[PDB]
Amino acid sequence: TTYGVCSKAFKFLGTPADTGHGTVVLELQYTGTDGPCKVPISSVASLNDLTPVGRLVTVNPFVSVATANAKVLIELEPPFGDSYIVVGRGEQQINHHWHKS
Structure with missing residues (x-):
């Protein structure tokens, strides 16, 4: 099952x-052990607005194991221009900028 x-x-x-x-x-790489769990990731325009603007190819991301430092590969299609790939949320959410030419 998936929590x-x-x-x-x-x-x-x-x-x-x-x-x-x-x-x-x-x-x-997931630092957690609470998995199986869902990966809170999304392609948003900017850090100020979490309204999704890109789309996942590998939809409904999964961390299928309950051991730490696992590893997930997730394909994503950002929007043209400048976008921020977001993973996590709170003081946890990581951030990475991307640019589509």
Whole structure:
């Protein structure tokens, strides 16, 4: 079964990979152990507005294990221009800027 959302922070591993299409692959490590849980990630315009503006290719992100420092790969399609890839929330939410040419 799958609980709710992952209550712990994730770390950015490597740099967001550009697929060539118009997406990016994220190499995420989870510091948590509460998983299975859902990854609170979304492609938003800016840090000030969490209103989703991009879309996931690997929809409904999952951290399927209950051991720490696991690892997840999640493909994402940001919006053209300047966007912020957000993972987590609160003093936990990590942040990464991206630019689509």
